[PDB]
């Protein structure tokens, strides 16, 4: 093959982004190579597939405070300050136009990570729709009416239950009938209004729910997704909030959309699978990937090293060592199937009726103990 | 550029408001600048964006006891006692008529602050479904169908109450039971559709809910929103109550509308974010910005020093420095923030009917 | 007073907007003055209050196809192509900065005009929540059960109504009880679900409801309100739809938010009071004015004719002739109080119970005719 | 500008797709240009914005029977049989890898079209509140409390059904009646919260609702969305069904998924607006644009003629001419577009229990 990479004093200026969060893909290091992460060693393993002994260098790009803007990093490959950008560079439609990429060594897609549904189930959830002061007064003004039925008339007390089945005490019964009819509808409304607002809360089941909800959306700093959601999804820039690091990415969702926080974070798929292992079982990609392109190495435009390394990636992809390096660093995977595309429907709490029928079980057994007490 | 600011024996007469409350934006200071606050430091950096060395002074305007009228402070720039007014001057139309502002360096809006309150009404809120004409139609036809019991028969009325509880007259029981079964669902469906939307209406408020309610309205001392609601919203001046400092903004709302206090203070947006940070979240912005203009610096009219200081604000804002100045002083976002049932109306009917029966038992005994 | 307007060959270049819709304020005309409308004669009446015999001209600005952009018209006063703009120029905060205005001869405010609530009231509204095929089958499977009660057992037919008040036919009654219990809840839900969606439809009760509803909003062509709702209210430009003329302004609201239409039109107050007289009783300003500034005449910046005509307006405002000219053209006023800030609450249809109790009145009278038939 | 397009004996080889369906964007023509459609007239005006006289020709690419693969049409620009491809070429990544596009002159997205359909399910939708474990808990404890009737007493079970309808055992009637009264409201509140949100969920659809449902998917002939869903969305190719023309887009959805037809055609946004204008509103876009890129013109890679033709699109669009060209061809917005009850499940139970009683009456008679 006619190209020979020259043997001269200019090295290969690998541009390295200076990542603050997600130091497992690419990061600053104290070692004699100088850089650490995943795509570094991916780029390292691509060297031995080529017959070129390649001298090179590693230049960190951003600061040590926040993530570097890759569109500025791509421009520094356009401006020929660098020879090649190696990192988490996502193939975006401008970026394809201005520089040259390889084949995607890995795939990726923009996801929506969001807090999961925490739905309660208790005997408290059964007795929920009235106040604790209301459940005593309503039962209190049954016996308060029933004590007046005595004036119209434990073993002595059971006789009035026979007469309260179906003069002046009949007029007491008529108004007491209108009591129960409203408390029928009052419990009906107050349980409906809880089962409605629980369904009609601030929810998202995809990017389309997240666009039209006019809520603040979190992103990371220096990514395409800020200028992607503006230029494509028709989102106001005041919704889109950049965020610096993974310790901030949680507490912006621990606060939820309020306390200054955002509704949800839109990031790429392989960042979030690290984040799920980094977090507890509280979050999930609520939809599918809505922009699925992948990564790649940014080269100089019309570089002869492209088709060399484009073949080397596809060769190494067939050899399975790409997945073996993907086992060395990116072994962090856990499902914790909290919710799995759960249909929001009727779904009445199974423990809410663990509080009804077991108190009914107490009553039937207390009926049976007094039954044996006669025996 | 043709204009160069000359360096003669006269300095630049910056008008500074003698600010009493909210001393984070601007304040009297014992430093050798003599000034302290946000809009000072906003002004200082745009000086450093000029190609000019700018000799300048700072003069406090009003009395130290109360906040002065900024329109009179604007008027001194018209009266040429100052070269430029720097402070919390908010862009109003007749303020723009006489002096020339800069671009807005911050965004401010008129909001209404008011205490948070309960949502549940009286015993009559229990009765609120079924508009009250149709209760008399209900109870009227309730007894009118019960009059058909007495056809199909003090001693006769008890027999009319005997078959009322539980032939052709028992076919009348068939049709009426079908009716009141619907009325049971009709009162149910009306009650549900009230208690559902009242958990979704966060908009049950408004500036008009204050205008129509002829309540005492608190205002801060020396502001445009005093004269703004009078000329535009036509609100009576007896409703408008001035306030001099920050702690009086609380106690006039601690007392509520009664005890001499005010119901809802109409102040600007960036002031309320300071004060709600200072307190607990017992006080709420009942709506949104009903008049949103923003602040600005007021040079004397047709002065070329306004022009480059306008563009210097644009260059400094797009750089991202005003926000860094903002976090230096106002990084203050410390803001906190199901369904149940409580009423008393039907249990009064539990009290009326039951003690009535004791008298008849006392009249029998 | 030291100023004297000169007696020379240059006339007074009055800039006149070429209005397509609302030709009652200012319009092209075939007359020797050349222009027609309201603010023309307002400007005409301001001349005789000044002691200056003023020669002048009238220049139409826009085309005959759509309304001219007044910010371009104000710029043509800045660019000194014109001496004065006379028309519907609203005092906006840039416009105060770049030119000089008079005092407002009239006041105005941005309103929200919107379709009114049409709520139905009928005996059909009573029998609404089931299908017409359902109201016959449900009543059909009462007598279908009741015909089996005959096998357990008009003047002969009335006997089973006595036995259906409260063996194997008792087992028929138990399942028939479970029929009515569900149809109780089935009518309860289907009437709730109609009374809920009627409340939770696409509604607006102010500008704040109209901002957060992310709906298309109509405006007129060449106004500040397009660049006002963007720069202040934080509204996406794809919602804001300009519209050319008053025959289009109706059919964009006759279609509602769908069929390509918009949700509501935001215009100034004096345009909409013409539009209400121009329309039937179908629309109303649903809120108060949320941006209330008024009109004025745009002058050259630092013109001596300002304080002359600023005094002349305030003089004529005190004389009441300003309202008399406001009677010559702007006499079009009608209320037609369809809805007047109506509280959306319980409000159960009075004619829905005109269908219940009158059929109950038929039944009670048919009971009384057979009562007299025995007599 | 350094480059000038030379005027030698060779013209500009515009690749034109031999377009069969949707002949409003581009079509074979008998005119002396030989071309007719939208993207032609979009191309012609940006020629007139150049400082150049541009000699040019037009060649139809594919067969007139079917729509050709545009990727092969893109490949001929790579194969240098054409100088530039002009048509409905949509910007894809590997399409951008080999040739150089212009800026997008129109905005297109992938949508899914499908017929409108009913929302009500079977007799089991009547039973859908109360998850089916809790019906057996209901009916199990319904008869278990009815077993306490028989303690407090074929002839004995009828007496157990006698007191079941309407002492210490009558105190058991007190507590159980309180329970089933709640269950009446619990089934009511569960049914209401289903029939309320199902009038608010317009989002009960999706591309994933087609992916998981392993349905036949119709595609147009010679498109990227054929190969797009295969490589990206991993959908099996047996689901994918090609279609050659416009009338076959209807009849494969007239037949539905069965009778050999397809369930939902995935085509681009500006095609669907043509076709839904052509038909009645029986066919719906089930969601939004799940892949939105836009069209473009494809010059040969690293040709300077792409650069000025890119900026000419920007100058012509901001002038407002592309929309006037758009109304000349596609001014087509002709698009049309309460709650009730219908089910059959409980009336089958009306059929089961009643005809069972005729047998016992026949067994008695
Ligand atoms: C499209 O991508 C490019 C590069 O990221 C941007 O276009 C120009 O790129 C050059 C680099 O040679 C810069 O000098 C220009 O300033 C860029 N122009 C603009 C307007 O930014 C451009 O930012 C991207 N476009 C979008 C919409 O994100
Ligand atoms: C709008 O602002 C102007 C400018 O201050 C006000 O006009 C001044 O009013 C004071 C009141 O005593 C007087 O000095 C003059 O009448 C004006 N001063 C000038 C012209 O220098 C005007 O009153 C304000 N409008 C309203 C409604 O208050
Ligand atoms: C504010 O109003 C002015 C006047 O219409 C606009 O500012 C500039 O006005 C000059 C007139 O000499 C024009 O030549 C400039 O093009 C205008 N600037 C811009 C950026 O267009 C200005 O547009 C208005 N502000 C807004 C937000 O619309
Ligand atoms: C993306 O486009 C390229 C360019 O056409 C495709 O590569 C070609 O594939 C055809 C298949 O027969 C062959 O001619 C060559 O392998 C390629 N031609 C070239 C490089 O000129 C590529 O296959 C497309 N991607 C996918 C996933 O189909
Ligand atoms: N995938 C993103 C990452 C940006 C970042 O890490 O800051 C990109 O390539 O633009
Ligand atoms: N923005 C107000 C502030 C008034 C005050 O702080 O007293 C004004 O300029 O009038
Ligand atoms: N009041 C609007 C009217 C605009 C118009 O009529 O086009 C303005 O002055 O800008
Ligand atoms: N936008 C599609 C159109 C395909 C077609 O019309 O057949 C493409 O470029 O592939």
XYZ file of N, CA, C and O and ligand atoms in Angstrom, chain B residues 19 21-22 67-71 88-92 95 108 110 220-225 249 268 271 295, ligand 6:
114
model
N -29.259 53.704 49.490
C -30.063 52.498 49.583
C -30.123 52.005 51.023
O -29.097 51.894 51.699
N -32.771 49.248 52.281
C -33.011 47.812 52.285
C -32.407 47.211 51.029
O -32.191 47.927 50.048
N -32.176 45.894 51.059
C -31.508 45.132 50.000
C -30.146 45.751 49.675
O -29.916 46.317 48.605
N -35.828 54.833 51.543
C -35.438 54.734 50.148
C -36.014 55.906 49.356
O -37.207 56.204 49.452
N -35.190 56.577 48.555
C -35.664 57.764 47.840
C -36.429 57.393 46.583
O -36.337 56.269 46.082
N -37.188 58.359 46.076
C -37.866 58.208 44.795
C -36.827 58.195 43.688
O -36.104 59.177 43.493
N -36.744 57.079 42.964
C -35.775 56.979 41.884
C -36.128 57.865 40.706
O -35.236 58.217 39.933
N -37.391 58.236 40.556
C -37.781 59.173 39.522
C -37.224 60.566 39.762
O -36.809 61.223 38.804
N -30.457 50.600 40.791
C -31.524 49.684 40.430
C -32.566 50.340 39.543
O -33.754 50.015 39.656
N -32.148 51.275 38.688
C -33.085 52.039 37.878
C -33.699 51.128 36.827
O -32.990 50.492 36.038
N -35.023 51.058 36.820
C -35.761 50.124 35.988
C -36.389 50.898 34.840
O -36.918 51.995 35.047
N -36.323 50.334 33.636
C -36.681 51.063 32.423
C -38.197 51.224 32.359
O -38.940 50.247 32.226
N -38.652 52.468 32.462
C -40.048 52.855 32.334
C -40.098 53.822 31.154
O -39.081 54.411 30.779
N -39.426 57.370 31.955
C -38.014 57.378 32.306
C -37.153 57.337 31.053
O -36.056 57.902 31.024
N -35.590 42.042 35.061
C -36.444 42.179 36.227
C -37.891 42.267 35.774
O -38.190 42.767 34.687
N -42.155 42.740 37.416
C -43.035 42.959 38.553
C -43.745 41.661 38.907
O -44.412 41.059 38.062
N -42.842 49.100 48.297
C -41.605 49.616 48.856
C -41.519 51.118 48.631
O -42.221 51.684 47.793
N -40.649 51.765 49.401
C -40.511 53.212 49.329
C -39.700 53.590 48.096
O -38.679 52.964 47.796
N -40.161 54.619 47.387
C -39.432 55.177 46.264
C -39.318 54.263 45.066
O -38.211 53.918 44.646
N -40.455 53.878 44.495
C -40.487 52.928 43.397
C -41.426 53.443 42.316
O -42.190 54.389 42.520
N -41.361 52.805 41.151
C -42.270 53.127 40.064
C -43.578 52.364 40.166
O -44.600 52.849 39.669
N -43.565 51.192 40.812
C -44.750 50.344 40.889
C -45.839 50.964 41.749
O -47.001 50.554 41.665
N -41.462 44.413 55.610
C -42.101 43.608 54.581
C -42.666 42.323 55.159
O -43.604 41.756 54.588
N -40.509 44.015 42.735
C -39.837 43.512 41.552
C -39.325 42.097 41.792
O -39.163 41.659 42.931
N -35.766 41.396 43.819
C -35.888 41.661 45.244
C -36.539 40.508 45.988
O -36.126 40.184 47.104
N -33.594 46.214 34.259
C -32.914 47.397 34.767
C -32.107 48.066 33.665
O -32.265 47.782 32.478
N -36.803 49.027 40.320
C -37.369 50.038 41.201
C -36.676 49.997 42.569
C -37.263 50.931 43.615
C -36.604 50.785 44.970
O -35.672 49.964 45.096
O -37.018 51.493 45.913
C -37.246 51.420 40.556
O -36.351 51.653 39.746
O -38.044 52.326 40.802
